[PDB]
Amino acid sequence: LGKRVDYSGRSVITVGPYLRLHQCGLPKKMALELFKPFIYGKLELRGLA
Amino acid sequence: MIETINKLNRISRQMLQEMGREPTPEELAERMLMPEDKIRKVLKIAKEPISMETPIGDDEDSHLGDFIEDTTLELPLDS
Amino acid sequence: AAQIRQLAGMRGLMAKPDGSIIETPITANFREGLNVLQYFISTHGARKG
Amino acid sequence: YSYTEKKRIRKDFGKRPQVLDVPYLLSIQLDSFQKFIEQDPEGQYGLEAAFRSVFPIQSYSGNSELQYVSYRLGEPVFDVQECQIRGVTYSAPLRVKLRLVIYEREAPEGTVKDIKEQEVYMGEIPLMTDNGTFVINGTERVIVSQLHRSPGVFFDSDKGKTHSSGKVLYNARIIPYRGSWLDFEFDPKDNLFVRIDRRRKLPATIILRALNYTTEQILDLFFEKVIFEIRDNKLQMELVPERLRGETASFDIEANGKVYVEKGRRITARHIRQLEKDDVKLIEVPVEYIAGKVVAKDYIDESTGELICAANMELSLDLLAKLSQSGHKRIETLFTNDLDHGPYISETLRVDPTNDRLSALVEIYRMMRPGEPPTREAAESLFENLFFSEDRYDLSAVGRMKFNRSLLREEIEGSGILSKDDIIDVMKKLIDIRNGKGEVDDIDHLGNRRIRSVGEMAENQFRVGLVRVERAVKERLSLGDLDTLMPQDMINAKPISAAVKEFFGSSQLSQFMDQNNPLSEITHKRRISALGPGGLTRERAGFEVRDVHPTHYGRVCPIETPEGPNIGLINSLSVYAQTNEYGFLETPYRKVTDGVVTDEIHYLSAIEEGNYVIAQANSNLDEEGHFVEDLVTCRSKGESSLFSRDQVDYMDVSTQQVVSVGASLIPFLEHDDANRALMGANMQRQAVPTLRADKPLVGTGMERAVAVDSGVTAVAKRGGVVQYVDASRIVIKVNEDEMYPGEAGIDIYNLTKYTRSNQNTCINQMPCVSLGEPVERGDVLADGPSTDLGELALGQNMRVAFMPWNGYNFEDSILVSERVVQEDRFTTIHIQELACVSRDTKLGPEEITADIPNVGEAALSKLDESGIVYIGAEVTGGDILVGKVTPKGETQLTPEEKLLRAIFGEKASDVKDSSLRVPNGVSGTVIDVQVFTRDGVEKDKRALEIEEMQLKQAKKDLSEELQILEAGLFSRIRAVLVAGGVEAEKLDKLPRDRWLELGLTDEEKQNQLEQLAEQYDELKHEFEKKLEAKRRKITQGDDLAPGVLKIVKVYLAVKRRIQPGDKMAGRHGNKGVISKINPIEDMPYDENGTPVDIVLNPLGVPSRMNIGQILETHLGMAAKGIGDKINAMLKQQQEVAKLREFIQRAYDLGADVRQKVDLSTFSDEEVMRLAENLRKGMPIATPVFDGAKEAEIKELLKLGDLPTSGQIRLYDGRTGEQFERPVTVGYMYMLKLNHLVDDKMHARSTGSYSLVTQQPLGGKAQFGGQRFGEMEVWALEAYGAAYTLQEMLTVKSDDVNGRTKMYKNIVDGNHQMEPGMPESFNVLLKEIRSLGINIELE
């Protein structure tokens, strides 16, 4: 029922006051390691890799 | 090999009582009249493997089994 | 209003561990300072909560 | 006063002068350990208590005897640094000389037949250092003191919810050190069922008939005897005055010839007084009056018959006629009442299962060990070894002291075995506490919770190890062959060392001591937990152990306790409370003699406090000892009320009595809530220092002692003059008054360099004293990792503004400037460990080489031919630190990779890229590369050069130590030579090597010269001995786990800055997360132009009731204004004598300052250094409950050229316009936490799965994502999200053939949901199929 899952990043909460209600912040390192299949697919579909 | 490792444990206890320090494999190998690599080989297979429900953490919320690496690895490379 | 009334004015009532109320409430407030006895009577109900 | 005080004079606001100073802050650890380890043969405590409670032993039928006489703990074979880096338990062999004698068979007492007095090593007990830490397996552990149940009797009262319609149960238990739990639990029918070790209930007469006493004896030994009389066949009663009291008159109670009462009359005190005054000789009673009063005698027929009525027989009219027919006039019946002495033991005797002694004893065997039918001797032996045996029951005159003090006795000395009258005493106290007469204690009282310290629990663990080796030696000794049987091999080292290593490092009491701060170390050593064996658990506890008692005043502090599940189980010790000889907690007090107080120290235990009155130290006190305000509030008998002057006998010694040492560091606790103080002290324990330890501006007065008492700093064992100070060592020259003739007069302090703690942070003993200045005894020489000049430097001090700025400080979050990292103020060294382990599998051992395939040359550019980085290599997150490849087996390749190997020259051989790289995101350098290896294994060039570097270090440092020691010894020799005579040419111009043989005329100075010469000869001997020990220690075979080739350890040291996401908190629990590193052009600023550094949230003040942080902020602004005045008067360099008046004016503003220090008695250079240290703020102390009121803070603001309102009209940085409201701005002295963002940010994307249920793991060191728990599943299903939940439990983590297909679909761009059979639902399916239950799908 309650299971560990991939693509789950443990991180603390900070304040983004310059954003919209549907918008949150994300670290570039955590989005780099977290979105790795999306990064590889977008790099292969664009021809850059 | 159970008999030889029991004799090795008894010789290690005797050298602990005669020295006080931790028993090196060299004195146990020369008292066992065996080569040292066989002594370290039967020392490697020392005891029962740590069961899966030992509290390796600070509380009773996460036991063992949540730390084992996968032998049949499926890396981003391998997938 | 209860937080402001206990901050600026005196504390109303605390919690004894047996379920009763301490017959000697805190006469002083937070800006004046709490005595070592009065901080103990406060931390009784605080640790109970 | 001393010399280290003169730099940064810590001005205090203490309005009451202290009598007793700060005691040793390692009391319950180090004093218990030295009570445990020292040669104390007369006291029978510590190791001697177990050694005299087990030994002497004997064999069967008097054939041999093993005795204990002349134990001696040997020298520790290692020191702290090599056992920290190696992973060996810091211990010494306990070589106890056991003397095994053999009894003579023909002699009645065997004196000497074979004296086997051989020194026998029995276990390796760990050694506690001067810091108070235990280095077990490399990690620096500290075992917390257990708050167990106090041994002896304990009376408990239920809180209801067990039996309805009232009728509360006053149960009582007997607690030994170990063994059985003799309980006395009542019943709704009030039968007082005896329970042993949480088993089923049994009647009380089962245990009372096993002491060979009959039923009439146990009836007479519990109640008074009311002798009824039959005078010439008329019913009378010889009434005692103690029986008829507080009852009703069932009949006309009259005298022998005078009428006194009628039927149904309420017998008040007037009737009792008239009866006791006129006559109580013989009162005639009706026949129905004794019917109800059960007889307590076994009255038989006096001529020849048997027992016509036994004890506890329900008397009737015909039974009374039979007693009048056969018997005597004297009838002893059981006194029946309801509130004075009820017939409860008769109700035990109405339901007894067995009456005989045998059956009775057996009736027990079935309750203890059911199923086995015992014999007589087996049940007797089980009763003896369960209740009255020294091998299974021990109290050692402390549990007996509690047993005598709680049952209204007077003896202090008692044997550990319970007596036959002790059960009678506890049952009489049970009847009295059920009848209302007497007071009952509770669980929350601190006289019922004792301190099981390190020494006592280690004594108990060594005791149960002694029971295990006793069970070994009892079957080893009674099997003959006692000629070749010297007692070394008979005492096996496996169970004793296994017990003392299972307790040290694996028990619930032993844990990782956070060595980030000295405050954390001294609050983890003074930490009173209640976990482990004997104590409670975090899940099986109630509100009684967590909510504090009025007896916790000064002994157990209510603040320092974690905010997790066990919020009250892990308590802590205060500063002045030490341990007792018994083990209870005592608070020191000053004695008051009818309103006249003195300055002596009187410790008071928790039980003896319950009948006294306790006055607090916050009352008004004059200079000779009186009460000023004529009416003070005091504590009495566990409550609080108003008291007079002459009624008080005890006075508290200081204002910081009730708080921990982690809580006494919290300033303005009188203006602080208890809600935020507990977690604020918890995260002050979790606080982590910086690169440069800045001076703590706002203090408490405890800062001058916590560094000296922690042990991590350079402590002054002998005081003198500074001779030479290096960055890694300090050499102080000891003066003549503290000089010993058996020493060299030089105390070199080998300062510990950058070693690893237990929380992945740095420990660096930075030298803080200057060259050429006197340092007296007990002062500081080198500040530790989080100290500064002997004062606790927990964090840094900077400008904090309690104002909102663009919503960044939204819900108590931190908004920092650029200068916290531009000036490197909040940057932090973090030393981790990464042991690249080369284990030996079947397919070849793991070599450590440099040629690694599938990697570039730039990644191997910072490596040698061995693959290890050079010292000082600035590695980045993702690079390889040690090239440790493994020889892999020939795994069967896919045909596409086989075609790829056939086309190109890519030939991947048995070498496999399994080198442990740097974790991503962790930058930094390397500080040390510890290499260890197995015996018989050759070394490469890197391990050889690291061993050569360690040998060069141990050579050069010891050679410089011997050189400066020789210089100090020859300086002492030169001082003796110029004290005796004077020769400016024969002594000084001649070289120092020919100084031992040169001597003057025979005098005591010449004898001291010869003593220093032979001491130098012993120094030359011990230098060679230490060089031989270093040769046999450095390049020795490092004993590691078997099957390992070589273990190399690295230490990454990152300058971890205050990144956005770091945890940073002040001193009042105002925690927060770094929202954004704001540029200093956007930060607000005052009219002087100083840009603020921290923008704090003022919204968290009225809800969390922490107004003391505002008082701290105003006092910090006043101290910083004084510091800017000092810096303005210092940079001009106008004069010095105006500063000696200005800082003296700044040191006296309160009603009565605790220290009346004057700057007129100081020198020019000392005042100049004091002002130079006062440039970086002003050190100002404030007590936790004797702190400064806002009037003195307003005077401090007036003296520092600041407004009286405290809030300064501020200017904005973003818009430049000044606000309509003045902004409270000042100094908070906030600290860097251990929950940094590089220890908190942790993600996971398809790496290192499990094998059991095919699950992703957890933890950052294990590289596993956060648990998507069941509450998140219910919330995601409450949204109605089906496709996300079908990914989050089936195709992202569960299905191994599903997540690979999902990865291949996302890589090729097809984001289509492809579900399938989950690979952990079939785990449950095969689990319940193997369980024996058929299940399948449709």
XYZ file of N, CA and C in Angstrom, chain D residues 1083-1208:
378
model
N 18.881 44.160 0.384
C 18.646 44.053 1.812
C 18.455 45.438 2.430
N 17.588 45.554 3.435
C 17.388 46.849 4.098
C 18.594 47.250 4.938
N 18.565 48.501 5.390
C 19.705 49.095 6.076
C 19.216 50.253 6.932
N 20.025 50.607 7.927
C 19.673 51.652 8.876
C 20.115 53.014 8.340
N 19.996 54.051 9.175
C 20.420 55.386 8.774
C 21.936 55.530 8.765
N 22.652 54.695 9.522
C 24.109 54.707 9.459
C 24.611 54.088 8.161
N 23.853 53.151 7.593
C 24.189 52.541 6.324
C 24.606 51.093 6.395
N 24.563 50.476 7.568
C 24.938 49.074 7.703
C 23.856 48.191 7.095
N 24.164 47.392 6.073
C 23.139 46.513 5.501
C 22.855 45.338 6.422
N 21.568 45.019 6.568
C 21.181 43.908 7.426
C 21.529 42.595 6.728
N 21.806 41.568 7.527
C 22.195 40.268 6.999
C 21.056 39.261 7.001
N 20.226 39.259 8.040
C 19.133 38.306 8.182
C 17.822 39.076 8.239
N 16.841 38.622 7.465
C 15.484 39.147 7.509
C 14.605 38.052 8.099
N 14.215 38.222 9.356
C 13.483 37.209 10.101
C 11.990 37.518 10.122
N 11.199 36.470 10.318
C 9.748 36.600 10.302
C 9.241 37.025 11.675
N 8.547 38.159 11.791
C 7.919 38.520 13.066
C 6.561 37.877 13.285
N 6.092 37.049 12.350
C 4.774 36.438 12.475
C 4.767 35.289 13.472
N 5.897 34.607 13.642
C 5.994 33.487 14.554
C 6.188 33.837 16.010
N 6.144 35.117 16.362
C 6.310 35.551 17.750
C 5.054 35.320 18.600
N 3.815 35.832 18.253
C 2.730 35.721 19.242
C 2.095 34.340 19.346
N 2.160 33.528 18.286
C 1.625 32.171 18.383
C 2.540 31.271 19.197
N 3.840 31.338 18.941
C 4.809 30.489 19.616
C 5.298 31.082 20.929
N 4.825 32.288 21.279
C 5.040 32.952 22.576
C 6.518 33.154 22.913
N 7.372 33.261 21.898
C 8.800 33.475 22.118
C 9.132 34.958 21.951
N 8.777 35.727 22.985
C 9.094 37.154 23.002
C 10.508 37.413 23.495
N 11.176 36.396 24.047
C 12.539 36.556 24.520
C 13.556 36.759 23.420
N 13.241 36.329 22.196
C 14.125 36.611 21.072
C 14.112 38.094 20.715
N 13.016 38.800 21.010
C 12.976 40.240 20.780
C 13.819 40.968 21.821
N 13.775 40.496 23.073
C 14.644 41.030 24.120
C 16.110 40.770 23.797
N 16.405 39.576 23.272
C 17.757 39.240 22.838
C 18.192 40.103 21.661
N 17.260 40.425 20.763
C 17.564 41.274 19.616
C 17.855 42.709 20.042
N 17.091 43.231 21.008
C 17.337 44.584 21.502
C 18.648 44.665 22.277
N 18.934 43.654 23.106
C 20.205 43.615 23.821
C 21.381 43.419 22.868
N 21.177 42.678 21.776
C 22.223 42.531 20.781
C 22.463 43.802 19.991
N 21.398 44.565 19.722
C 21.556 45.869 19.083
C 22.295 46.840 19.998
N 22.016 46.793 21.305
C 22.740 47.645 22.248
C 24.213 47.252 22.351
N 24.496 45.944 22.390
C 25.879 45.477 22.439
C 26.620 45.788 21.143
N 25.929 45.713 20.003
C 26.564 46.065 18.741
C 26.767 47.568 18.616
N 25.895 48.374 19.225
C 26.129 49.809 19.252
C 27.327 50.180 20.103
N 27.498 49.491 21.237
C 28.702 49.666 22.050
C 29.941 49.207 21.282
N 29.815 48.114 20.520
C 30.925 47.643 19.707
C 31.300 48.578 18.572
N 30.309 49.211 17.937
C 30.606 50.213 16.916
C 31.188 51.482 17.523
N 30.777 51.841 18.744
C 31.416 52.958 19.439
C 32.878 52.653 19.756
N 33.162 51.416 20.174
C 34.533 51.000 20.457
C 35.362 50.962 19.174
N 34.770 50.484 18.075
C 35.471 50.454 16.794
C 35.689 51.853 16.227
N 34.783 52.790 16.512
C 34.977 54.167 16.071
C 36.045 54.866 16.902
N 36.109 54.565 18.200
C 37.153 55.132 19.043
C 38.485 54.403 18.914
N 38.518 53.260 18.231
C 39.740 52.491 18.028
C 40.428 52.796 16.706
N 39.660 53.001 15.633
C 40.256 53.277 14.332
C 40.835 54.683 14.246
N 40.384 55.601 15.101
C 40.964 56.939 15.128
C 42.294 56.967 15.867
N 42.491 56.033 16.808
C 43.696 55.906 17.640
C 43.992 57.197 18.403
N 42.956 57.731 19.051
C 43.087 58.998 19.762
C 43.698 58.806 21.150
N 43.106 57.936 21.968
C 43.603 57.679 23.311
C 43.118 56.311 23.766
N 43.653 55.868 24.902
C 43.280 54.599 25.507
C 42.524 54.805 26.816
N 42.833 55.885 27.541
C 42.261 56.108 28.866
C 40.779 56.461 28.826
N 40.266 56.926 27.685
C 38.826 57.139 27.572
C 38.084 55.816 27.431
N 38.727 54.808 26.833
C 38.120 53.483 26.745
C 38.043 52.810 28.108
N 39.034 53.050 28.975
C 39.021 52.490 30.324
C 37.911 53.074 31.188
N 37.387 54.245 30.828
C 36.205 54.790 31.479
C 34.923 54.384 30.763
N 34.956 54.293 29.428
C 33.739 54.021 28.664
C 33.283 52.573 28.819
N 34.208 51.615 28.711
C 33.826 50.212 28.858
C 33.518 49.892 30.319
N 34.129 50.622 31.258
C 33.758 50.477 32.662
C 32.374 51.052 32.938
N 32.006 52.139 32.253
C 30.636 52.635 32.324
C 29.659 51.662 31.683
N 30.096 50.939 30.652
C 29.254 49.954 29.984
C 29.134 48.642 30.750
N 29.907 48.454 31.818
C 29.894 47.213 32.580
C 29.044 47.287 33.840
N 28.454 48.444 34.144
C 27.654 48.621 35.361
C 26.446 49.490 35.018
N 25.317 48.845 34.717
C 24.072 49.565 34.481
C 22.876 48.975 35.211
N 22.971 47.751 35.719
C 21.861 47.113 36.391
C 21.744 47.541 37.841
N 20.893 46.813 38.569
C 20.718 47.076 39.994
C 21.947 46.643 40.781
N 22.394 45.404 40.575
C 23.630 44.917 41.188
C 24.227 43.841 40.279
N 25.322 44.193 39.616
C 26.004 43.281 38.707
C 26.772 42.261 39.538
N 26.750 40.995 39.097
C 27.340 39.904 39.870
C 28.857 40.027 39.983
N 29.511 40.648 39.002
C 30.954 40.878 39.044
C 31.225 42.380 38.991
N 31.846 42.906 40.045
C 32.198 44.323 40.103
C 33.644 44.531 39.649
N 33.894 44.173 38.394
C 35.236 44.255 37.826
C 35.559 45.703 37.483
N 36.829 46.067 37.637
C 37.311 47.406 37.335
C 38.424 47.334 36.299
N 38.440 48.304 35.389
C 39.476 48.391 34.368
C 40.687 49.196 34.821
N 40.650 49.768 36.026
C 41.779 50.536 36.534
C 42.939 49.653 36.974
N 42.680 48.384 37.281
C 43.717 47.451 37.698
C 44.331 46.690 36.528
N 43.940 47.009 35.300
C 44.461 46.342 34.116
C 45.584 47.167 33.491
N 46.319 46.531 32.585
C 47.429 47.169 31.895
C 46.951 47.802 30.592
N 47.846 48.574 29.965
C 47.518 49.224 28.698
C 47.352 48.198 27.582
N 48.231 47.194 27.538
C 48.189 46.192 26.478
C 46.977 45.281 26.637
N 46.602 44.971 27.883
C 45.433 44.127 28.121
C 44.140 44.844 27.754
N 44.043 46.142 28.060
C 42.863 46.918 27.682
C 42.813 47.116 26.167
N 43.982 47.246 25.525
C 44.019 47.360 24.068
C 43.566 46.068 23.392
N 44.007 44.914 23.902
C 43.531 43.641 23.362
C 42.063 43.393 23.687
N 41.595 43.863 24.847
C 40.182 43.747 25.194
C 39.314 44.577 24.257
N 39.766 45.782 23.903
C 39.027 46.598 22.944
C 39.104 46.023 21.533
N 40.243 45.420 21.171
C 40.371 44.790 19.859
C 39.464 43.571 19.736
N 39.283 42.828 20.828
C 38.312 41.742 20.836
C 36.878 42.245 20.965
N 36.680 43.429 21.549
C 35.372 44.068 21.619
C 34.983 44.763 20.322
N 35.896 44.838 19.350
C 35.548 45.372 18.035
C 34.510 44.497 17.337
N 34.636 43.175 17.467
C 33.677 42.238 16.882
C 32.529 41.961 17.858
N 31.776 43.018 18.158
C 30.666 42.918 19.082
C 31.108 42.908 20.533
N 30.115 42.919 21.420
C 30.355 42.972 22.851
C 29.851 41.703 23.524
N 30.721 40.937 24.186
C 30.255 39.753 24.924
C 29.461 40.157 26.160
N 28.179 39.804 26.160
C 27.248 40.192 27.212
C 26.480 38.957 27.675
N 26.547 38.672 28.973
C 25.877 37.507 29.528
C 24.550 37.896 30.161
N 23.590 36.982 30.092
C 22.313 37.164 30.765
C 21.810 35.821 31.294
N 21.436 35.749 32.570
C 20.980 34.474 33.136
C 19.626 34.055 32.582
N 19.317 32.771 32.777
C 18.118 32.202 32.171
C 16.854 32.652 32.901
N 16.939 32.923 34.208
C 15.805 33.442 34.961
C 16.162 34.649 35.816
N 17.435 35.037 35.861
C 17.875 36.270 36.498
C 18.368 37.274 35.464
N 17.749 37.275 34.285
C 18.190 38.116 33.198
C 17.804 39.567 33.380
N 18.157 40.361 32.375
C 17.934 41.796 32.434
C 16.491 42.125 32.080
N 15.880 43.002 32.872
C 14.596 43.586 32.524
C 14.818 44.623 31.414
N 13.723 45.047 30.767
C 13.810 45.960 29.628
C 14.287 47.359 30.011
N 14.261 47.716 31.299
C 14.801 49.006 31.722
C 16.318 49.054 31.565
N 17.016 47.992 31.980
C 18.462 47.949 31.790
C 18.837 47.784 30.323
N 17.993 47.124 29.527
C 18.255 47.046 28.092
C 18.045 48.408 27.433
N 17.081 49.193 27.924
C 16.911 50.560 27.438
C 18.078 51.447 27.859
N 18.636 51.205 29.048
C 19.830 51.936 29.468
C 21.048 51.539 28.635
N 21.142 50.258 28.263
C 22.199 49.799 27.366
C 22.052 50.407 25.975
N 20.811 50.599 25.520
C 20.580 51.274 24.247
C 20.899 52.762 24.336
N 20.629 53.383 25.487
C 20.960 54.793 25.676
C 22.466 55.006 25.742
N 23.197 54.051 26.317
C 24.647 54.159 26.392
C 25.337 53.831 25.073
N 24.634 53.215 24.124
C 25.231 52.867 22.850
C 24.755 53.724 21.694
N 24.202 54.902 22.016
C 23.670 55.885 21.060
C 22.583 55.245 20.186
N 21.509 54.828 20.848
C 20.372 54.174 20.219
C 19.101 54.620 20.928
N 17.966 54.654 20.224
C 16.720 55.104 20.858
C 16.206 54.121 21.901
N 15.387 54.657 22.812
C 14.837 53.864 23.905
C 13.747 52.906 23.446
N 13.134 53.157 22.286
C 12.067 52.291 21.801
C 12.582 50.939 21.329
N 13.867 50.838 20.992
C 14.463 49.609 20.527
C 14.338 49.375 19.036
N 13.225 49.783 18.435
C 13.025 49.666 16.998
C 13.583 50.907 16.306
N 14.519 50.691 15.390
C 15.174 51.773 14.664
C 14.446 51.964 13.339
